[PDB]
């Protein structure tokens, strides 16, 4: 699976009606759509138009180190009208997405996201599916671009966001079908956003995954909270036609669900997703230390006590892992703010905690950390050398909230 792409600076009318200056993965930003079977060391070159330097992270997603689009021994970053070859194979079914490793408040902010579809290679049970595909823009009324970075509303849980974007479309007219069942790959993509999510107005639905890495079938539920860096394959039986079915986030008009007819019998419930493959962890075997938090110009947003720029590029080890070796964390948030804390390279399954109590334990790449919880994640050392992590709010990495381990 061999591909194209360019990194275009488009003028996209985002605003209805107006400019936007913006940078895009290709056309239809937030990004271009990958499909990729799950297998082929998915060839691609990436492309600059843009006037600066930067990568294409694998979020998530479980590569080669090199190739993760992370600055320095893995991979040094990439330049104005030049090329990357990207190659890794992917383990990791379900959506993922890509997006780059520098400067990012600014980079992402003006577009640079995108989805990653990891196509099951078991046949989808799924007959029809969709990409819902979330951010909120940077921009302010005129379509010009507020500010990506600010101080005082970045300082406590991010930097705001405005425009409600699925697909790059304020108010969604997505149309579905009488009776079937269907994928709805939903992908939070934005900076900063934590957005909490639900549906009202008529309709039956049910969940397989979450952020790409699977698990049984819960349904409908409370309002499931979804963070920057995080995903969620999930299914719809939209009932008999018409029904324009509210999706909302707590009470929020995010976008729109036409029930559109057809001459077609039902595409009843799919069993359960065949879970990822994953560095399964022994659970009394591992060991385990800890910690996040805290509050000089520059993020005061301290981790673990570590600054981050002596910690800048090479690496004063800011953690010291072992391969193949059976692993175990406790995270504290202990500034009266919430944050959603990523992994790449590994994908990790979580345990026990406080917030919310666990019933099945669940796979993703990144945990969505709770003011004062203390959560019991665990993994294994499955891919190599020095892997990054962190607050997956944009802005609470960019500056000092960042840190990093290898293997
Ligand atoms: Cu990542
Ligand atoms: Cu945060």
Request: aromatic residues 8%; hydrophobic residues 35%; negative net charge.
């Given at each position: 699976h061999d591909y194209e792409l360019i990194a275009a600076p488009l003028d996209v009318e985002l605003v209805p009606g107006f400019k936007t200056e913006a940078w895009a993965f290709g056309p239809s930003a937030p990004g271009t759509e990958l499909r990729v079977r799950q297998g082929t060391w998915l060839r691609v070159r990436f492309i600059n138009?843009?006037?600066?330097?930067?990568?294409?992270?694998?979020?998530?997603?479980?590569?080669?180190?090199?190739?993760?689009?992370?600055?320095?021994?893995?991979?040094?970053?990439?330049?104005?009208?030049?090329?990357?070859?990207?190659?890794?194979?992917?383990?990791?079914?379900?959506?993922?997405?890509?997006?780059?490793?520098?400067?990012?408040?600014?980079?992402?902010?003006?577009?640079?996201?995108?989805?990653?579809?990891?196509?099951?290679?078991?046949?989808?049970?799924?007959?029809?599916?969709?990409?819902?595909?979330?951010?909120?823009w940077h921009v302010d009324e005129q379509g010009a671009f507020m500010p990506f970075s600010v101080p005082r509303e970045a300082a406590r849980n991010?930097?705001?966001?405005?425009?409600?974007?699925?697909?790059?479309?304020?108010?969604?007219?997505?149309?579905?079908?009488?009776?079937?069942?269907?994928?709805?790959?939903?992908?939070?993509?934005?900076?900063?956003?934590?957005?909490?999510?639900?549906?009202?107005?008529?309709?039956?639905?049910?969940?397989?995954?979450?952020?790409?890495?699977?698990?049984?079938?819960?349904?409908?539920?409370?309002?499931?909270?979804?963070?920057?860096?995080?995903?969620?394959?999930?299914?719809?039986?939209?009932?008999?036609?018409?029904?324009?079915?509210?999706?909302?986030?707590?009470?929020?008009?995010?976008?729109?669900?036409?029930?559109?007819?057809?001459?077609?019998?039902?595409?009843?419930?799919?069993?359960?997703?065949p879970p990822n493959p994953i560095a399964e962890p022994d659970l009394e075997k591992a060991e385990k230390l800890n910690f996040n938090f805290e509050w000089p110009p520059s993020l005061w947003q301290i981790n673990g006590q570590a600054w981050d720029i002596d910690k800048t590029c090479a690496d004063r080890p800011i953690a010291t892992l072992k391969k193949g070796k059976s692993y175990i964390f406790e995270l504290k948030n202990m500034t009266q703010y919430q944050h959603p804390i990523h992994l790449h390279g590994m994908s990790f399954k979580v345990i026990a905690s406080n917030r919310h109590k666990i019933t099945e334990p669940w796979f993703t790449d990144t945990y969505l950390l709770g003011r004062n919880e203390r959560a019991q994640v665990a993994l294994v050392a499955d891919n190599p050398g020095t892997w990054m992590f962190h607050c997956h709010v944009?802005?609470?990495?960019?500056?000092?909230?960042?840190?990093?381990?290898?293997v």
């Open positions: 138009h843009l006037p600066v330097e930067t990568t294409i992270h694998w979020h998530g997603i479980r590569l080669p180190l090199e190739m993760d689009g992370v600055p320095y021994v893995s991979q040094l970053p990439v330049k104005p009208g030049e090329f990357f070859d990207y190659k890794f194979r992917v383990p990791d079914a379900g959506s993922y997405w890509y997006h780059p490793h520098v400067s990012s408040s600014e980079e992402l902010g003006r577009g640079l996201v995108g989805p990653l579809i990891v196509e099951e290679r078991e046949p989808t049970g799924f007959l029809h599916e969709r990409t819902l595909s979330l951010k909120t991010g930097t705001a966001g405005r425009l409600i974007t699925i697909n790059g479309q304020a108010e969604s007219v997505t149309e579905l079908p009488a009776g079937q069942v269907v994928r709805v790959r939903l992908l939070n993509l934005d900076n900063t956003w934590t957005y909490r999510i639900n549906l009202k107005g008529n309709c039956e639905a049910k969940v397989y995954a979450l952020d790409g890495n699977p698990v049984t079938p819960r349904p409908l539920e409370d309002e499931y909270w979804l963070g920057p860096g995080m995903r969620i394959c999930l299914a719809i039986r939209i009932p008999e036609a018409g029904e324009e079915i509210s999706l909302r986030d707590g009470f929020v008009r995010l976008g729109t669900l036409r029930s559109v007819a057809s001459s077609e019998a039902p595409g009843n419930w799919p069993k359960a997703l944009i802005d609470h990495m960019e500056t000092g909230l960042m840190a990093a381990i290898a």
